[PDB]
Amino acid sequence: MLKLGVIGTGAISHHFIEAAHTSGEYQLVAIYSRKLETAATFASRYQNIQLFDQLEVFFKSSFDLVYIASPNSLHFAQAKAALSAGKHVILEKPAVSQPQEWFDLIQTAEKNNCFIFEAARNYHEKAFTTIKNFLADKQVLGADFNYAKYSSKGGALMDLGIYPLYAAVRLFGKANDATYHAQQLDNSIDLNGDGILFYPDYQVHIKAGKNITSNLPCEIYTTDGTLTLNTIEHIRSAIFTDHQGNQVQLPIQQAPHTMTEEVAAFAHMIQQPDLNLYQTWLYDAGSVHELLYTMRQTAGIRFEA
């Protein structure tokens, strides 16, 4: 059973650990933080846990797999070290700051014979395969995908818009081109925006937001009607309705936790590895980052650097 290091002492790491313990395929063994006393309070609720305040000491320790949920700009350097040290890596949020970074990581992963996963929770939902199947014999004409919730209270594209993007990519694959126009702070970071993914026969609208809340359903239009998903993350209900008002519920069963499904996937992959499927995860994560990068560019969203 899988021995886990954690970086990132934010709430989300707790949600990851919670989920990883519940699947019975993980044991948390180690936490790192620049200050030991932060790691200590993070660890108080768990037991048999090594605390670390030096990254190299941390990586020389023996656990198989490190979960990284630090601030985005640290992800690349830390993954790189993690894989160079023989740990599989799982990267939260937006795995990386830009496309090439994903690909250096992949090389680094390959060379060192380990896995690198993006913790894209919605991408591993059973629901997608179900939806994906259902649309194999339709002709898709369009789609509208949103994820916009008022936070407390980076940028909306990178933190939330990535969910719609992963869903579009999950169904659909890479779009040919994309655009994004955002409301921006002075620093150029986006509070909310509307994007479009251009596909040869259709386009998909993406809405992202953090200073606003949308409760809009997500829709896929087909020549014979509209598939309606209550959301595109932790998906709960897919009902298709034809131009005549006949309806089909799809068999959707939401996991008990938003990370149940990706957490089983990462574990099943290390233990019973299907490598073609691994290629597809790398592949898709690559497309998502490509589009994030394109869209930030059309929107004028630069980070420090």
Binding site for its own copies (CB under 8 A): 141-142, 144, 146, 150, 179, 181, 183, 191-194, 196, 198, 201-203, 205, 207, 209, 211-217, 219, 221, 223, 225-226, 228, 243
* Separation CA 249–CA 57 (nearest Å): 52
Structure tokens at 193: 């925006």
Nearer to its own copies, 282 or 301 (CB): 301
CA dihedral 84, 162, 256, 136 (to 10 degrees): -110
Question: Rounded to the nearest 5°, which phi and psi values hold at 215?
Answer: -105, 25
SS3 218: strand
Q: Give the residue with the Cβ less far from its own copies, 29 or 168.
A: 168
Q: How far is CA 279 from CA 79, 110, 173, 266, 285, in A?
A: 18, 11, 14, 14, 10
Shorter beta-carbon distance to its own copies: residue 16 or 240: 240
Give which of 192, 182, 204, 203 is closest to 298, Cα–Cα: 182
The residue (of 145 and 266) whose beta carbon lies closer to its own copies is: 145
Least spacing, CB of residue 153 vs its own copies, in Å = 8
Amino acid residing at 80:
K
Q: 152 Cβ partners below 8 Å, 6+ apart?
A: none
Among residues 240 and 281, whose Cβ is nearest to its own copies? 240
